[PDB]
Design a protein around this nucleic acid. Structure first.
Lengths: 319, 324, 319, 324
DNA sequence: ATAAGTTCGTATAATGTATGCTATACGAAGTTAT
DNA sequence: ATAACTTCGTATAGCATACATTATACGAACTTAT
DNA sequence: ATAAGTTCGTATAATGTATGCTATACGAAGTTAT
DNA sequence: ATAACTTCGTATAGCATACATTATACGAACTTAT
């Protein structure tokens, strides 16, 4: 009750670190949204009334937002309440059923959550075939990045977190990248992402022209200014936003500027090589169980999602 | 759980009824009618449902010789009616939990057989193809394209009915592709492409010359053909799934005759036969569990497995070892 | 309370079928035991007092019983109570900890739960090599049984439940045995246990000399009297106790009469071919995932248990 | 939870203390002492433990630079002390749950490294074997047999100490088998047999001529050797695991010298080194994950996996594809 | 007499963990246009 | 004196026993068609 | 001036589900017999 | 009349969306060393 809510909420703010910085950014972005919808209609934003939550989801739906975004708003509200020691909006038929209904009506009109434009071995080979010959710091960095992204399948944020001290060697001379935390795990054991001899070379070239290896505690990737001078750091990472820019720029290099549609995934992006690699592995005949360790997935669906038709019966028949 | 809460819960249900498929509602209504009539008959109250009363009903359903999976559907819908109304579910009562268990146990031990569609394999398509490709009959031509697009594709009945003519291409060689949509999962697919042979694509040509189905593209590929053998396209009505089940039943009668062995199910061919046979054929010629637990969108096994079980290729490692 | 207990217990007896006939036999055997220990010491057997349960387990321990048997007594008592709507003995430190302690002290003195003498391809081949030539009804039956036991790995009770109507054909001519319920599953889908061409023959010979195929609803296996005349039935199964006797007799045939030790597993028994087959599969190089479907196991431990050392390092070293 | 209930719970604990290993009790006592002293120091009550107080302690432990797995052990033992006394566990409080999470998150992001034993691979055994097989020294002879039975076998330290002379055979060729017992699981094993080479079995011969360890069979294979280089068998005392850890540390000093790089762990060889190296060697020559996630009784992976990770044979499918 | 069980009691080993929403099945009753 | 330990205590890496039931193991007492 | 970011907000895709008992680590303090 | 359906209702086989969070997608506003 009131005192208890102030304490539960307060207890949450104290140990903020317990959750991702991003969960907080969304908690707040959703609350900003809901509070706004609430003011305009003179309703109390907290605790939220199921019926109010319901008109809110319907209102997001009418704004033409994705089922996933609508489910994000409901999930943030649910967390605020549950962690508040209060009932969850989803705990009410009104909210439970409207969610189902919005999802159901949205899909049955098409809506499908999207996946990033793939970046496979071919694009890597072509891009490398062209960038290989550059002596520019930016280019050397960007090719090492793409190479690591394709080879390791790590998420951009995990790549930005790599520190020089995290790199080792196999004996065959292959670089070994030690991975601490991921979206799926936060352990002291952790992974050892290995690189192919060619990708190591690539990386090796970047560490060299950049002088990041200066401090072991330095981030593997950093800014590189117009003058071609890198700017190593053990406190600031190269933003995932910039990493996303590498993918976009590399795609703009080969295919030119993008549509005017305003759609997403017109060019490669942070997850392009993960999708792309996962795939390439399927074809090669790699074992799902294997395609899975590559991406660090403890399950089979995403994996399943990334490779398909979206044939065989035409040969039995065809003969 | 207070009748005012319940009344609010029931209005919630009706207000957001689009939360469920109409098939689901149909089943819910059906179970309630059955449950209500039995309560009347037996002098019990049907809402809310009392555990002892629901237990007596589940036994009544078993005594009726219904399938363990059917008794499940009943308890299931009841459980939802109460769960989504604010009352305790019947499944939450010891007596209801115990009886379902026993009943399940008793049935499996009387020989309870989970059935699956009678295969419609290539040997079947060829033979049918044999008795028909030479038929001038508008309905004979149409029913060929169908078994073609059902077998060549493993598409579901509710799925072929949906198909429009504005959904076909010509890809790789007078072949033809059918952009589908055999998913309804948001994080699945948008649609796919199913291709055809000299078998399929062709038959699917004669159906268009005679169906004159392509005159307008909003239309649907498959339409009804009246007694005079005249076609009637439509961008507004699709052939019923019942009608497609008919073409399968009709087709099996032509070869084997009068309804057979009892009043049982799957005595002939049904909507799923084509998908069942396509698989085994695909498993017989050893074709990876990709276009097997996949070709008919089964990103989810036992299915391709319950279908190819009696096959010899799926005999197991013991037979393989015993035989060297 | 009292009324509630009488009803919970009563509700259990009404739908007796909900559980295995064997669970009941043990519920009662344990209660008989506990009630006996209780009378001798003037204690109330129900509800059971943790401290009383504890001296009871210690008393079983002192009688030299197996940890597993002691855990069976505690588990039956726990079920009587839990299903009674009363606390479980194990819900008390006294009972919780004494169990741990008895287990701990028993193992640390050796104790290891045993597994049945294996019956592998070799024993099958030898036994068949000798029995093959018999024209006796008993022998033909017994060889078909052993063959099915080894080939299918089914538990004896599942084998006794096979009915003629359950048998089919693959096309290659191989027999297919449909399995309804197992210890691990009670479903309408169920399994299709296949037999090798040689084992089918064997079976085929038994169905023939026996005339069980007379009624489809007849049990595949039945008694066979001294006069050599089988005795088909669709109501009585050949007891699992007799099936166990086939294994023992076949072993006595080849190796003679058993020890005087009074130990278990001196000869083959109901589970001998399951262990034996599982094993043979390991060696063949069969995939655990495969060794697993054979036995119908939805997990990896038992499977793991049955094949081991209980070598490789002596070649690296040896060279 | 009433002090009379608690007092009964604590007597229950002491009465059936044999429910736990003495190592476990040692750790429990240790955590309590640490928790008690900090409560005193900070003016808090140590029993029962208050969530805010336990949260302040877990932060104190982190500020102390302890490993996330060590803070876990503390909370863990506290949670048990309270669980087995009838009081609510600290882990059951939002504040304690949240802080453990954060702390875990914060640590993994400072580079928290889970360490494993420094390998003691064949290259290591040969080289050591090289610098010693020619040593007359009683202790030099004994320490060879040991690294032999540790590497050739992957047996654990607490395990080789247990070994008796009445546990050896002669099997297949002057070899020798060591019936063990590397299990303590009731539904595991009774014991096993570990075999040896011309490498091992032999060294294990010279240790017996000089140790005169076999004079009586109740004795244990490995014994202490005093400063005069004289042996002292015993059917009653086994070499401490500390002593076996010593032979590993001593041995690495002989080759590399004075304790190295900081006060860190695994700077030299430790009891687990032999099992770590045996594996990689076994993985390097491509030897199935049987005598790999098995040879050292690991019916339970990540172990053989955390050990052979930097290896080239375990590089992954991406490297394999990128390299053709 | 007796082989070949059955039944039964105590003893001990072996094993999974689950649903609930939506489609097809099929006899039939209802509807159109030949 | 120190070598060679053992015992300690705190630190951390490596595992594996509790639920709830369902089944098999085996001697011995009883049952029936020969 | 400006390339090359950073930061930040709204929008939307992607993913696991967990511990707690027992062993080893290692510096050190304590114990024996050379 | 019936063929050829469609609509129904009860029976059953075949699937796949809810949690709780943590992450990426991308335009645009701002920041800094050149």
């Amino acid at each position: 009750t009131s005192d208890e809510v102030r304490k539960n909420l307060m207890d949450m703010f104290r140990d903020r670190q317990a959750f991702s910085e991003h969960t907080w950014k969304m908690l707040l972005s959703v609350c900003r949204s809901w509070a706004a919808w609430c003011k305009l209609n003179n309703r109390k934003w907290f605790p939220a009334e199921p019926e109010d939550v319901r008109d809110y989801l319907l209102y997001l739906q009418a704004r033409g937002l994705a089922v996933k975004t609508i489910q994000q708003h409901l999930g943030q509200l649910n967390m605020l309440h549950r962690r508040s020691g209060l009932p969850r909006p989803s705990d009410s038929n009104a909210v439970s059923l409207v969610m189902r209904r919005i999802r159901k009506e949205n899909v049955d009109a098409g809506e499908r959550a999207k996946q990033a434009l793939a970046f496979e071995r071919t694009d890597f080979d072509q891009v490398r075939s062209l960038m290989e010959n550059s002596d520019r710091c930016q280019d050397i960095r960007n090719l090492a990045f793409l190479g690591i992204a394709y080879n390791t399948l790590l998420r951009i944020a995990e790549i930005a977190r790599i520190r020089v001290k995290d790199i080792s060697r196999t004996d065959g001379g292959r670089m070994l990248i030690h991975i601490g935390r991921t979206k799926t795990l936060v352990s002291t054991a952790g992974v050892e992402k290995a690189l192919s001899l060619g990708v190591t070379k690539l990386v090796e070239r970047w560490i060299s022209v950049s002088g990041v290896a200066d401090d072991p505690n330095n981030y593997l990737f950093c800014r590189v200014r117009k003058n071609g001078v890198a700017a190593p750091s053990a406190t600031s990472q190269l933003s995932t936003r910039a990493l996303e820019g590498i993918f976009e720029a590399t795609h703009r290099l080969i295919y030119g500027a993008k549509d005017d549609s305003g759609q997403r995934y017109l060019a490669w992006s942070g997850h392009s090589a993960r999708v792309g690699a996962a795939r390439d592995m399927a074809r090669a005949g790699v074992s799902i169980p294997e395609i899975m360790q590559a991406g660090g997935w403890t399950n089979v669906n995403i994996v399943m999602n990334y490779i398909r038709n979206l044939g065989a019966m035409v040969r039995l028949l065809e003969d």
